[PDB]
Design an enzyme around this catalytic site. Structure first.
Site, mmCIF file in Angstrom:
data_model
loop_
_atom_site.group_PDB
_atom_site.id
_atom_site.type_symbol
_atom_site.label_atom_id
_atom_site.label_comp_id
_atom_site.label_asym_id
_atom_site.label_seq_id
_atom_site.Cartn_x
_atom_site.Cartn_y
_atom_site.Cartn_z
ATOM 1 N N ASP A 54 -3.134 3.405 -7.869
ATOM 2 C CA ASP A 54 -2.995 1.969 -6.597
ATOM 3 C C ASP A 54 -4.298 1.240 -7.105
ATOM 4 O OD1 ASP A 54 -0.218 1.868 -5.560
ATOM 5 O OD2 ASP A 54 -1.003 2.865 -3.718
ATOM 6 N N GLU A 214 9.121 9.697 7.452
ATOM 7 C CA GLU A 214 8.431 8.421 7.955
ATOM 8 C C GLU A 214 9.735 8.000 8.197
ATOM 9 O OE1 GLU A 214 7.777 5.512 4.767
ATOM 10 O OE2 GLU A 214 9.127 4.880 4.445
HETATM 11 CO CO LIG Z 1 6.467 6.556 3.224
HETATM 12 CO CO LIG Z 2 10.504 3.838 3.204
#
Ligand SMILES: [Co+2]
Ligand SMILES: [Co+2]
Ligand SMILES: [Co+2]
Ligand SMILES: [Co+2]
Ligand SMILES: [Co+2]
Ligand SMILES: [Co+2]
Ligand SMILES: [Co+2]
Ligand SMILES: [Co+2]
Lengths: 391, 391, 391, 391
Positions: A54, A214
């Site tokens: 990134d 997540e």
């Molecule tokens: Co994540």
């Molecule tokens: Co995701």
């Protein structure tokens, strides 16, 4: 208002997502890392995270690489932002089509470790404390293509080496495995917070390992995210957390936190913040791994960055009010929520004392206890009224 | 044809399910236990399992209870059927509406333990080796109603006690927790095979605990059943297995094994039977935890029982043929399946030797490697053709 | 072996997918359309399809465009392939981020119509009979952002116009709306075969519109594909069909047909082929809208293309054996499958005569009827044994 | 506070559910219908609904049935509650194990129609205007067990007779088919609102037929309920509505309205009440088809009944404030929501004129339009801030 004490962090790949999805081209231009640092600082974030690729384009010479690191470093300096976590991209390049650490091709596995060791060096230089590992390509589309057992051995072999190195170089890193059930592989290894936790328990230095669950990933399997975090906390393996929104089992949406399952977003903040004795039950970064919708421009991007913080602070405020309400306190008592904290057994009581207690069986009136209600709907209605700002 | 060596077992509650569902009355009359033993013996089953309440009606006086056990043992005796596993009903009676071990009510928790201790004694008496625990009422409909952390504490408290008792008494039981994501509760604690394995690692005598995964329960979350079994075997926690069929995320169907996800049923049989030596990778009972469809009468029941055994033996046969085919060996070689079994590192190599290997990174041609195909579709196609008897 | 009478067709974008997914770069180079024509002719396809932009790069000058078409026509000429259907790309370019036909922006809606008219012209020129319309960007991520009623008005308004044009130019095209529940939009309009049929019925010349359902799209919502196609045929709205594979509610996999839900692929082939009067119930193209997995090279690509054909033909062969089997015939009779075809009322009976029949109510023994089984499990087991080639 | 003008209704089977689920015994004693009338009137309901078998036990003699009805009518009189809709139980009794109207058994189909005709009479006598048809048992567990085409023919055959009887008797009833994807059958016919609408369009008198969609049922397939409701309204087929809560694809939870997907509940209330011309877009009953959780006693039952109404009124208030907010209006204008309501073609413009407009193609700058953001995220954030009472 967000304070550095709120510990909101964003991935460079979040606000920087150009919105090239599986069915269309990018709708936004590339975001300069330095600009990202200034913009996030400005909206109230305390830290930024990134994938090696990134910040430094895959294949940059050391001269370029070095230059970029220097500028990024300056931006952090001027703004006061920290880098609490770093991660490595082991999914984009075609070489990783069958995985990094668990690719069937031996050469790819050696290469994936090298790529990560390198990123560990940069992470340590920037002061990062957590290495997040997202095994996005570890898994398969067909059952006969991947020996899961062999794969778990190879995942373990690689992680063990990483801990060895960090410990020897004195980096003091913690490793967080990020679970995902599918996408991009048909099925990904370690599909849930549960599978990730079980796996870490088998490493050489298990104390250095935990998970980075997540919101949308657990929701992709229709699991209760809050309940799964609660379990992670019970195990003391919640090393980091990615917050975002999702609408059940479909592609990974990565919406703003609270824009998907709102009721679970609420129970989540309550769990993290209204920890034992006032204090939060979780102390790490509140990291947003989300994507500004493809339909938005840079204005939409900054707006969505702030919506995440906003959602988290509005929910916290309501979770606090919920718990502080004497009527909730009364409903909690009636539902016996705290009675679950009292051991089932008396002090020093064992099987023999229990077997001799006639009240626990022979003289127990199951029919009479079976008829009392728990008053759960009412407690639930009280929580939603707090959420709606109606109480 | 089924042999005792195949180890097919059935729960009394499978063939005996009267088909009273959430929306309708029972369409079948009760099955007599002695009769069940005799019919199961005849179709090739080597063993039978049961919940306490399936055999002895809830609340039977001792004379009655004693009478039933005697008759049951005699049927066992005459047919040569064994009792490899037993379980306890902690879900039907209204007292268990918020759970057995994790009910908010302390008195129900005490009574839940007494009910299981009692079933352990009987299992010990009949020669059972495994105690399956299905926590069907452990969970919640609302997030504020259950303190997950306290629930795991109390679930652990109860299991530690069970193990203490078995070990003092010399029962030699193994304990298998059975995961389910939901139904009857909105969300059940320990929702997947992973969550259950992670949990078990935290008990006082972990070596005594494992899991009893069910095909359909992993599929209710859209997870890959074969892949979760592979991980369970890797952890050596596959203590028992419940085989059946399901069509993705919807209520628990409990179809005949192989009537839901057929491809995954095939890869599962291959995993269990085409084990390490040449030998099975799993040596326990192949238990069918299914339900004869509500549209069927007793002829349908007996047909569905045999269908379970027939699906297993037909898949086993094709799994063997698949592995023996030279064209499959070739496709396996091109996909590098076995290469995953070779350590990523050379013997005696650590991070220092890896960092010194320019070919693992500095001179690695990722572009070239990323262009070669794995030939996974072709391997999948050969597998499917073996399944269809097309080769 | 595939014959042209099988009518297997493929989109240029299927074998031509370069494998750039939402998380990684393309793993394959671009496929030359002429080569595609040649390769497909060799494996047995009878036709090819494409999106305007698959053949002619977006923003090609007239000369180039003309140039491309002419080479393309040559290849078709040389090979004998036809173009049974054409479609338009209204999803890739950033201008369509909020949709084509239902974009909030009016100028985009006008542009989308123009783009389609142009493709209708090329389609008519190539002899295509069907215009497939896939509204991939028609929908929303947020409920307040899209007025559904207005979007349906605009969708209708655009389709009425296309029918008008086609009819006036004498093109003789039929239009097939392709439903999909989500991806790339959070929610897509006309999410299932059902919603698309209902919509089509509201158009000005409904006889010109039908649907093009795709196996995977209905499975993304966990619906029964075979059952939905049976409803589509009942309505006479099956204008085209997209065959592929999927593993329930997750991102759109686009696997080879029969590589997802095998049992449903089997029942689908049986429905299409074992139509009334011996003959197929469906006579259009058997089109494969699938994607060669990202792990594959060009050989895996041609392998996967052939696998689609092989899967269909192997299933066809087993569906015929199944229906031809006397024991199946006996099971169908016991299950009363054909009794459903006999009207409920005797010829000439109306409510008056039904009300007068004491045997239908007053003297009906619901209890004796409810005790008889339908033998559905046995019938299912026979279907499967035919699929496994075990009978 | 609910007024009769709110038109809140409840089925007798909602507050009357004894909580016998698929895994356990009832936890509540039966509710007397007269008592239910009084309690409902008291919390603000304007009407009550019921299945024939909820009020009159299956198989009651005429004397018993007549007495029940009379007492019922008196309660209605004294409380002022009305009966806006009635329904028939075609799913409980074993005779309906393969369905009512579509059972493979001819005699069951005849009996099903007579059971319904008898309920239409009682409905017409109590003043009901809608007959809801929930075909819970019409479907299959196996694909070869049911000819769908024949099933749709039989379904249609039964429905045409019912419309005929009604019209001849001057009952003036409207018929609403209630879709459900699965449970209790593996797959139910007419699975989503779309499929039911498309079916209704094929009856002899379509104008008398519409749908009775339920929040949780569409969510069981992970579909957008508000969006499907918007389509039902566009077709003008929303004859009735069932409001409840669900957590995605799993068994039918039937939670209080707003306790499932809160954000979708909020956008649903906005759609229904903030219709075109200030006024509601829908004027039928707001019916709660829910179940008090199994953990509750009768106190919890009445609390849950009131929670439904409270939930609706709170969301309504927030939806109203949302729309009257000048900042929301400004965001709507920036997002171009209303611009979708403007025809795409100019008045009198046809394809001829469209083809002639170079601004629609030749001179269209796709790239510049494609770069403008729609501001959807910001609009969604203001919506949620209204729901949260933060604005
Ligand atoms: Co994540
Ligand atoms: Co995701
Ligand atoms: Co089950
Ligand atoms: Co089981
Ligand atoms: Co398609
Ligand atoms: Co698709
Ligand atoms: Co429901
Ligand atoms: Co309903």
């Amino acid at each position: 208002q967000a304070t550095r004490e709120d510990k909101f962090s964003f991935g460079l790949w979040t606000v920087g997502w150009q919105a090239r999805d599986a069915f269309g081209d990018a709708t936004r231009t590339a975001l300069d890392p330095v600009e990202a640092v200034h913009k996030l600082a400005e909206i109230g974030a305390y830290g930024i995270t990134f994938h090696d690729d990134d910040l430094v384009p895959f294949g940059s010479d050391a001269q370029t690489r070095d230059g970029i690191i220097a500028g990024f470093k300056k931006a952090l300096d001027e703004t006061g932002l920290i880098v609490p976590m770093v991660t490595t991209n082991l999914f984009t390049h075609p070489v990783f089509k069958d995985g990094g650490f668990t690719s069937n091709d031996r050469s790819v596995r050696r290469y994936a470790i090298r790529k990560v060791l390198r990123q560990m060096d940069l992470g340590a230089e920037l002061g990062a404390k957590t290495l997040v590992l997202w095994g996005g390509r570890e898994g398969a589309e067909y059952d006969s293509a991947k020996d899961v057992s062999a794969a778990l051995d190879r995942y373990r072999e690689a992680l063990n080496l990483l801990a060895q190195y960090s410990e020897d170089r004195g980096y003091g890193l913690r490793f967080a495995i990020e679970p995902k059930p599918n996408e991009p592989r048909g099925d990904i290894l370690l599909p849930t917070a549960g599978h990730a936790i079980a796996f870490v328990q088998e490493l050489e230095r298990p104390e250095l390992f935990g998970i980075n669950p997540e919101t949308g990933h657990e929701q992709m399997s229709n699991l209760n995210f809050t309940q799964g975090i609660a379990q992670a906390l019970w195990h003391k393996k919640l090393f980091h957390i990615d917050l975002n929104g999702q609408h059940g089992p479909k592609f990974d949406q990565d919406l703003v936190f609270g824009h998907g399952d709102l009721l679970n977003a609420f129970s989540l903040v309550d769990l993290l913040e209204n920890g034992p004795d006032g204090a939060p039950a979780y102390d790490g970064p509140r990291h947003f791994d989300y994507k500004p919708s493809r339909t938005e421009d840079y204005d939409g991007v900054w707006e969505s960055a702030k919506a995440n913080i906003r959602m988290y602070l509005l929910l916290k405020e309501r979770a606090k009010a919920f718990r502080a309400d004497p009527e909730v306190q009364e409903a909690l008592a009636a539902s016996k929520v705290a009675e679950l904290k009292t051991p089932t057994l008396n002090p020093g009581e064992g099987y023999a004392e229990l077997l001799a207690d006639r009240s626990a069986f022979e003289d127990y009136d199951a029919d009479a206890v079976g008829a009392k209600g728990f008053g759960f709907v009412k407690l639930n209605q009280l929580a939603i009224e707090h959420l709606l700002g109606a109480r």
